[PDB]
Structure formats: structure tokens, C-alpha cells
Amino acid sequence: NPFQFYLTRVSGVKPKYNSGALHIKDILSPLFGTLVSSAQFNYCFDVDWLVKQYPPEFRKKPILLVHGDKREAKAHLHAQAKPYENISLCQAKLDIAFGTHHTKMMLLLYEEGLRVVIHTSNLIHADWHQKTQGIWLSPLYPRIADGTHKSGESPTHFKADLISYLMAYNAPSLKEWIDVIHKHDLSETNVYLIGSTPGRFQGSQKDNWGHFRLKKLLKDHASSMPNAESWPVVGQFSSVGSLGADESKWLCSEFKESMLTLGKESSSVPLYLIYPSVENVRTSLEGYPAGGSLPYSIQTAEKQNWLHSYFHKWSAETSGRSNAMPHIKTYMRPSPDFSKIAWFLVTSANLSKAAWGALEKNGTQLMIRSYELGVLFLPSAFGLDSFKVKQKFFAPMATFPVPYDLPPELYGSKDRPWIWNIPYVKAPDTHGNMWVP
């Protein structure tokens, strides 16, 4: 696994499909480092559960929970953490309406160094039980000797970019973690950071975040190939926001335009969107309750039925996870026969303007509502022109482990996208139940 891209363990699949997977207890194990302190960035927390995932000998080390909760939600989280004297909270500012703190990241400070984990799972039991989730594990970063002056920077600029992401919170508890990062050597990092932070960005700052950040990296660090117009774009997500009355409002005009960038010079590129059908959810390991974590509302969906003609079923025989509903989000650029990919992104970002940004003020300002974070795998960062797609996820080794099946399979005429707040009472799920919200 030279890309250090992992799936979470899934209860109920055969051992061959969990052999190279990671549970949260594995990540926090003493085998990964001797914990001194940690920060848990996330959206939803079960604090009693979370502390039990740390090894007993590490359960009293300081923990910082970075969240976006307000009002009664914030009070509930404080009450959850109150019994644990070692747990501090950091409330991420959300000064733009309808924004969220979605970023999922662990900062793990050890006696031996520092590790960064960027992943897709909430800190609750159900997100690690029977879902398809993604994890990127950084190398163990050694500390820079006191008195030594070196950058500790990687060719992908990951150290400066992670510090920049953290500086946008303007938070004292995160300045402490910025100072920790400054003291470590991150030069071995071979991924690019793609973050979103709330704000309105113009000028140079426009390229710092969201889909303009992706565009800039693809312009600077990928190459266009002949017949590039035939290389599809694939997006794969667990929720969809309001994208507008037709595809030209945002999806195909600025989102797809950023995703199809390759190289510096200057559309019929196919766009495949992967999102679970009702049948995918009904026959899943969890049954209909998996749809609680696929929060596409009827109010949103009924305004954009044009979108569903882009939708393809969830299928993941390659990793034994066709019945483990996706909470991972991924985006990638495969070749016309899906045998190679020009790049791969794993991220918290769903298919929404809130997460990726939407242009404002006559195309001069990028407005983002939410916090998001992911990592981009580019062939150039590995001395390659493209990645070969791995045929079996858990089976050279410059081959990238794409976790679901290619080519994606279009919905059938009877399929419908999972919509969480309407009832399904025609056919029961794998546990014998209907869905009545």
C-alpha cells in the first residue's frame, strides 16, 4: 500500500476483505506511536465511544475536539465531554449561513513524532461498522532538532498548506497545533492538500480553496494528453446539495470545468456520478437505516430531477463492499477504458456548492460556506504519468487502489436515488423492516 490509502473495516464481510483495512482502534494503537496529545476534527461525535477507542494507557492524554456546533447542539457536546477532564473543545466559526464543519482529520502527537490522518468517518460507532469509508495515513513525521533550521517541507507543499488550513480557524487551540507542525519534518509527504474554509475569496486567494484549488493543482501538476476530451470525470458522494435549475447553473459550468483541467494550455467530457439507489440501500448490510447517512432530501431533489440522469449505482465487488453503503467521497479522472487514472481525490466534500464553492460577483469571488478536507494523488508526485487501476482492491504496486467498480453502472429505468425523508414501504430491507421517516 505505497499510497497509504485505506478503507475502514466492515463487519460481516469475509476476512480477505478486511485484511488491509483499518479500524479506529488500529489507528490509535500503540503500534502507531506513543500518544502524547491528539486533535479530532469532525462533524458528529459520541464522546463515550470515542474515548473507548483509544488504548487504555492513552485515554487520559489531552484530546481536542474541533467541531462546528452552535446553540443547543454545542451545549449537548459540552455535556458529553464534561466527564472527561482531559478533553477540550474548539468551536469552528461558521459565519456564513448554512455552513458546516465537515472536515474529518486526526492530528496525533507522539513521543516519536507526528502523524496526520485525513479520513471520511464521523466519530460514532455506526460510521465504522458497516460503511465504505476512506482513510489517508501520513508517514510518521520526525521532529526537527531544536536549533536546527530546515523547512521540513515536501515537494507538494503539504506542510505550509496544512498550516494555512489551520490558520483559517483563527483559534488559540489550533495555533498550538500549528506550532507542533512547525517543529516536525513533513518532507516525505507525497499528496496535495485540498481544503475548503468558509469565506469569500478574490484575487490570489481564489486558488486557495474548493474547486479552484483543485483546478490550480491540475493546471500546475498534471499534463493534458491526446483525446483528453474522452477521459471521463467520476464523482462519488453521500449527499447532494441544491445545484440549480439545470446543469449549466453550476454542475457543468464551473464544477465540471475545474474537474476537467489538465495542464497549462486551453465540453463533451462524460461526467459519471455515483450515488446509492433505493435498491442499493434496501439490500445493504444495514438495510434502510444506512439511508440515515445519505441525507439527500426530497425538497432538494424535486428541484433538480435533471440531475438524476447522471446517477450510477454503488458497486464495489473489487473490495467486497457492494453492500457496505458509501460514506467516503471520491473524485477521479479515468481513461476512456477505465484502465488508468490521471488523478484521485478522497475528501469530506459532497456534491454541493457549500463544500466546493460557487462563483459570485460576476465570476470574481469564490464563496464557500463549509469546512472540508481531502488529499489529492497526482502521478507526477510519484514520478509517473498515470496510475494503473488496481483490479482487486486487496490483491506491480504503482497501481492505485480504487475502492469501487469501473465502469460505473447507470441506474436502471426503475431505479431512484436514495432520498432520506420519504417512506419506502413496497419491499422490506435485509433486517425485515420498511422505512417510515
Ligand SMILES: O=C(O)c1ccc(C(=O)O)c(C(=O)O)c1
Ligand atoms: O448533508 C448533510 O446534512 C450532511 C451532514 C453531515 C455529514 C457528515 O457526515 O459530516 C454529511 C455527509 O458527509 O454525508 C452530510
